[PDB]
Write a protein that binds this ligand. Structure first.
Ligand code: ZN
Ligand code: ZN
Ligand code: ZN
Ligand code: ZN
Lengths: 207, 207, 207, 207
């Protein structure tokens, strides 16, 4: 297109005007800011997977492959799941529409919604999407830590730390959601802790 | 870690010092330069999937979901598969090692290697990885265009163009690999054309 | 070896001595008793999918493909999920052994176990596996009924009914678990009732 | 409806009237004749996976899980892929109808058809489907044998043998397609020979 031509022009102008990976970054397909811009990391530091609503699905061959490769082959010692506010995937999950094949992918998010349905049901409707985004990140870290790949790494004494962050488009800050695991025991404790802290609602948003 | 602390410091300093998507960008997990930096695109323009060796696997629920969502729901009219030189996933595919679960993901690349085994067998060993990277991009575009999602979009007269590029880390330029499809007929012609053009070897690299 | 020679001898001897399918049968790979034997149906009546612990995982391309083909192309009007007692898959899921790749598959079952943990915990330890087998079937009918494929089949007025049964290996009697949907409303209602019924315990099953 | 009542009546009547598995059986969801009937094996001998057109897709979590569980946990020493003539899945794959989601599943079969297009093209049109059914089985044994699971089972000295058969619905006789591997070398050799043999055509099959 003229859109494709413009892109080739931008690329040429950009390029003209102008190592080991240490992190696996699992982000969302509709997040606007690259991991590299958020973290100000040196190119090559980041190994990056992006899927809709930044999920670690138990049986997703794509994401699991990336994880096994990062951990077993690349020897990466930090995996970060990063969510973000105003997440179109999360809003897509919460809407009552038949969107087609994507809805099947998003049913995992809806399972998370129902798992925390008491919490999300005590909360004013217009605030739920942000809560769900945050809880999602906690649950995906929990899923990551329960994979065979990560359990096995921990069991053979490999150094591996999982992290679960969210960034707000309003200020650019990475906010730690509380689930940080270096072992299965630290995974269970920090997960429980994080859900408990998340379940403390602001009094002005309670139904 | 001190690596995680440094990252939070970089993020804070960065953030302090500091819309509709029109493209689906399918890139590789080990590529260093973000789509946004390569294309100099406005944030929100890009919807991005990253997997190892930038594949569209026939039955990958992750990637297919992203594609169905982009096309059917977001109404994106351009899907770009971008490969890159010095691709660790491609080198991982070509190596003779048991790397574990990831090897299963990379068997699709090896199927592509064998499909073009005459071409790649006429070429000096040390040049094959770059050829395979380029051929990979052509084949993934072909795979994308053969998905039910894309066929159906074309058949109901939706505007949808597929693109297959590679960027070289040495100069930052996006190089078009020749497969550009707006229909099933343009997909077959440009695919054949592109393989034929790729199969013309430099005389100094021929065995 | 001789095992295989024997196999061919058995078959040669068996063979010497001697159509629209209407049901989709989803059953477990462990299951001893074939669907035809259970139902005394004629050859060709059954279209069969077998996986470990008879799952309809939201994002499993294999099973969803079977379901979409069955519903949209074969026009099958009845889908049956069939569990069984003494299910090795269920037993595998409840053990805390590292079994490797399959553990990731069985994590969906453990999610279900946790989901119904209060109920399952108030059962006798030697009855829990069979209770989970039954709960599993109810949950998989629920999952089947929330697929985009089934939902939109119902939405466009296609006649389609979902069933979830279990047979005891000891006696071979099919027992209906109570989740039976001809639409999304009847899925909700009968799933809610099915779980509610399973939650009324018979004293001899009580811890 | 009455269909289902009848089903339960059939079963009640059938039931009233009236263990280590050693084989993994991968077969087609269409297949009319159960594995036990084909082999006259005892209940519990067979661990069974059924999918459309009996595929071992490189990245299918469902089938790979079955295989890993069978090999690593059940310690099964024989894996059998069994195709059949008049295969609806094969026929679906060869038609150029848009069938929806399942077409993506069947694209792997079309890749195989293209791979052997010269051979298949010199056959009579009414023999091609059955020829592709046989080629499919050989290719799926090949795929099975290139899985990380099988390869590393062989690498660590585990006894494991792969088989690929086809039965004609007309007569029920299992016929070995010639790919039979007890190791990666014997996979290569017997796959090369199996295809070579299938390529020697009998004149009555010639166009
Ligand atoms: Zn998002
Ligand atoms: Zn790469
Ligand atoms: Zn079972
Ligand atoms: Zn078949």
């Amino acid at each position: 297109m003229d859109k494709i031509k413009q892109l080739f022009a931008n690329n040429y102008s950009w390029a003209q005007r102008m190592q080991t990976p240490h992190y696996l970054w699992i982000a969302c397909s509709d997040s606007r800011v690259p991991a590299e811009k958020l973290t100000n990391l040196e190119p090559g530091e980041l190994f990056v997977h992006r899927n809709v609503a930044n999920q670690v699905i138990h049986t997703d061959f794509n994401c699991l492959s990336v994880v096994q490769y990062a951990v077993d082959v690349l020897k990466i010692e930090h995996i970060i799941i990063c969510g973000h506010t105003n997440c179109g995937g999360i809003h897509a999950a919460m809407a009552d529409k038949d969107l087609g094949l994507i809805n099947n992918w998003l049913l995992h998010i809806r399972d998370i919604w129902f798992k925390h349905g008491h919490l999300l049901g005590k909360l004013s409707p217009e605030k739920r999407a942000d809560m769900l985004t945050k809880i999602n990140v906690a649950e995906q870290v929990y899923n990551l830590g329960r994979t065979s790949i990560v359990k096995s790494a921990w069991e053979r004494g490999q150094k591996l730390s999982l992290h679960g962050w969210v960034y707000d488009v309003n200020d650019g800050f990475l906010v730690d959601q509380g689930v940080m695991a270096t072992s299965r025991e630290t995974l269970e404790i920090s997960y429980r802790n994080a859900i408990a802290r998340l379940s403390i609602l602001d009094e002005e948003n309670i139904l």
